[PDB]
């Protein structure tokens, strides 16, 4: 949400000038000012770096929650810097180990469906039936019916 607004607030006019110079081609005229997201596929490729198309679609559909099909210069800026790395250091390796030890409060060294299921239920979050299985795939990477240290580490990799 507006968290990434705060994240992009750090970049001042110094990157805004470059972003406007790049975006000027998008506003090529003969339009009503809607400014869609059509060119964004190559606009994000203006410097060469380009993420997966699925992430690009997620960014496109996520922004402009009003559904106007309009890419605000604020939204364009935050999505273009989103191509650059942006993370809050992802906790700490010892901190992550402590978090997993709390996760493996059963002291089994593995997390099944029930473990993380109860863990998230304690949070009280509404979780769909279409979920859980998605979380099962996210966690049980080896498809061994449990969550191991490596699977947890990649699951929680640099998330903050």
């Amino acid at each position: 949400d507006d968290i990434y607004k705060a994240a992009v607030e750090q970049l001042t006019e110094e990157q805004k000038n470059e972003f406007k110079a790049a975006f000027d081609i998008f506003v090529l005229g003969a339009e009503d000012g809607c400014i869609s997201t059509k060119e964004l596929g190559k606009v994000m490729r203006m410097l060469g770096q380009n993420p997966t198309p699925e992430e690009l679609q997620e960014m496109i559909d996520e922004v402009d929650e009003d559904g106007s099909g309009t890419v605000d210069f604020d939204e364009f800026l935050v999505m273009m810097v989103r191509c650059m790395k942006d993370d809050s250091k992802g906790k700490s390796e010892e901190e992550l180990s402590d978090l997993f030890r709390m996760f493996d409060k059963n002291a089994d060294g593995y997390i099944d469906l029930d473990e993380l299921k109860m863990m998230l239920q304690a949070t009280g979050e509404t979780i769909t039936e279409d979920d859980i299985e998605e979380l099962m795939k996210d966690g049980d990477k080896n498809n061994d019916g449990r969550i191991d240290y490596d699977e947890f580490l990649e699951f929680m990799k640099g998330v903050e």
Binding site: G48, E58, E62, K91, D98, L99, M102, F103, M119, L120, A122, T123, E125, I127, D130, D131, E134, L135, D138, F155, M156, V159, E160
Partner: protein
Amino acid sequence: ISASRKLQLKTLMLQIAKQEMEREAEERRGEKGRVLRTRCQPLELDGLGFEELQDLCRQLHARVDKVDEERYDVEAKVTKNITEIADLTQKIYDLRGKFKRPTLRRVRISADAMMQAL
């Protein structure tokens, strides 16, 4: 197949785990204080004879010896565990390096720059 909600759930579970770890640490501290108070009994010795002074002092010295013995034992155990932890951490790091270092490189660093030099 939602994506942003996955990040939301990740952050929420991270915060919940942090809170649980904090409360568990507080519980550990409280229980440790309770046990320390229970095991180390408080003694009052106002208005006593010097013979009782000698007896209590000798008992305290014996308790000091026993506690130092326990501390020596658990210290040796902890040092050995630390050595094993360091060894296993080194081994797992070596395995991870063997698995991943061949997959890290400088991709497209200068090949794309070769436009019309020739």
